[PDB]
Design a binder for these strands. Structure first.
Ligand SMILES: [Mg+2]
Ligand SMILES: [Mg+2]
Ligand SMILES: [Mg+2]
Ligand SMILES: [Mg+2]
Length: 438
DNA sequence: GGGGTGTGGTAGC
DNA sequence: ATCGCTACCACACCCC
């Protein structure tokens, strides 16, 4: 047990946090792409007609944690048992659940306690531990396989378990559903072999948004090919409103209020107007959804194809610790802030940059919220506060940055015992060149 | 037209 | 027990 005032807290928390792993893995994949392409020009031009293959592991952590499970779980059956990956037994996040579990309504992000109640009696939840190194090794085999196939002009990392793969079609060549199905089946088989038993699903289309939707329709362990020319009511009626990229719970609530609770993308596209859309969820998001309901990408989403090097380039650097934060005095808070700045500057030096603007954000216990929340060591119900500061000169100096971060904490006025979370941010990064004379 | 700030939401497991 | 990260767009609202 490592408490937050222990010097090892940051190391231990990040070693156990799957959300930290997800972000660190994604950051590393983007840096790797930039390094491998520093002298290449595989970007998509206006002259290119392309097919998108959106490829994603099915129930990634659950599949891999199963395939690598310890001898204690040897009898576990991936096809018949409801399986989750999680740390705990009660108010612990289900990071991933297999499709047996999902047949009872269990979802990624659910607490174990909530998921257990959806099982009929006699049906036992199997909880597997995280296998983080294995997750990374399987993802390595995934990206290795995608490259080795020599069928994509551009391979964009989305996450540890997901990539957007672009195939350029010469007008020389007549593309067909038959060829696309064969490519999907090749990819699915080669990844199944290369990962020793993991399955991917694939969405294949001529836009990013349709490929994402096709991917959802393909799961589990399948593929779907839906081009703009194949769109139909049957397609749109198959999707929930929050199946649309960019539509989470808050946008969903607004759409349901404005449009009389649509229950499918078909309902929505028959009811909406562009203007009512923009009024409900905002102008840019409204335009994105409007175009999406046409099967079309918006300008912002297309930038990753036209200029992947710019989109994938890191523009900020931060840490967030909103779990296990229980400090008794300002001395201990300040030491934790110093430890966090040390960690961030190590990352900042690895990428050979300085920073010209920093932010501290905190979570503070709501005045009427219990001191110990339902989730062990959780932040609970909180109010958020943030404050930023522009540095005079771009710098990587601990003394300057840590001192200003601690000043920023002081100006937010949160008593140490009320603190439930801290984020430390370098908002603007500046290159370091060969000329540092003045 | 340019700039700034803090806040909100989403994305992957 | 339990590990509720983190990058980045978009917004509302302020200044010249
Ligand atoms: Mg998915
Ligand atoms: Mg997946
Ligand atoms: Mg994924
Ligand atoms: Mg969505």
């Amino acid at each position: 047990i490592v408490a937050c005032d222990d010097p090892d807290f940051l190391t231990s928390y990040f070693a156990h946090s799957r959300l930290h792993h997800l972000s660190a893995w994604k950051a590393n994949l983007k840096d790797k792409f930039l390094n491998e392409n520093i002298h290449k020009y595989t970007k998509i031009t206006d002259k290119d007609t392309y097919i998108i293959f959106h490829i994603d592991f099915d129930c990634f952590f659950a599949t891999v944690a199963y395939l690598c499970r310890s001898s204690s779980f040897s009898a576990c059956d991936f096809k018949r048992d409801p399986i989750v990956v999680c740390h705990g037994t009660k108010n612990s996040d289900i990071a991933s659940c297999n499709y047996v579990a999902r047949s009872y309504g269990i979802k990624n992000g659910m607490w174990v306690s909530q998921a257990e109640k959806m099982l009929p009696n006699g049906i036992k939840l199997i909880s597997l531990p995280y296998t983080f190194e294995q997750f990374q090794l399987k993802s390595e085999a995934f990206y290795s396989t995608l490259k080795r196939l020599n069928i994509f002009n551009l391979i964009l990392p989305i996450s540890i378990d997901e990539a957007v793969c672009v195939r350029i079609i010469p007008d020389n060549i007549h593309n067909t559903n038959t060829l696309n199905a064969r490519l999907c089946e090749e990819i699915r088989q080669e990844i199944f072999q290369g990962t020793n038993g993991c399955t991917v699903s694939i969405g294949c289309s001529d836009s990013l948004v349709l490929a994402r939707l096709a991917l959802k329709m393909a799961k589990p362990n399948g593929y779907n090919i839906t081009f703009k020319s194949n769109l139909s009511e049957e397609f749109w009626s198959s999707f929930k409103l929050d199946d649309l990229p960019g539509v989470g719970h808050s946008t969903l609530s607004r759409l349901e209020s404005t449009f009389d609770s649509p229950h499918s993308l078909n309902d929505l596209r028959k009811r909406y107007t562009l203007d009512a859309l923009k009024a409900s969820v905002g102008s840019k998001l409204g335009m994105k959804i409007h175009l999406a309901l046409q099967g079309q990408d918006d300008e912002e989403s297309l930038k990753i194809l036209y200029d992947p090097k710019e989109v994938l380039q890191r523009k900020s650097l931060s840490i967030d610790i909103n779990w296990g934060i229980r400090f008794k005095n300002i001395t201990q808070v300040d030491l934790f802030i110093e430890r966090g700045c040390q960690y961030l500057l190590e990352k900042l030096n690895e990428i050979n940059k300085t920073t010209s603007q920093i932010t501290l954000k905190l979570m503070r216990r709501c005045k009427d919220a219990p001191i110990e929340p339902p989730k062990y060591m959780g932040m609970g119900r909180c109010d958020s506060f943030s404050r930023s500061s522009r540095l005079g000169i771009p710098t990587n100096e601990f003394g300057i940055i840590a001192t200003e971060m601690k000043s920023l904490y002081r100006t937010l006025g949160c008593p140490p015992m009320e603190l439930r979370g801290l984020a430390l941010q370098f908002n603007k990064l500046v290159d370091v060149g060969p000329d540092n004379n003045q």
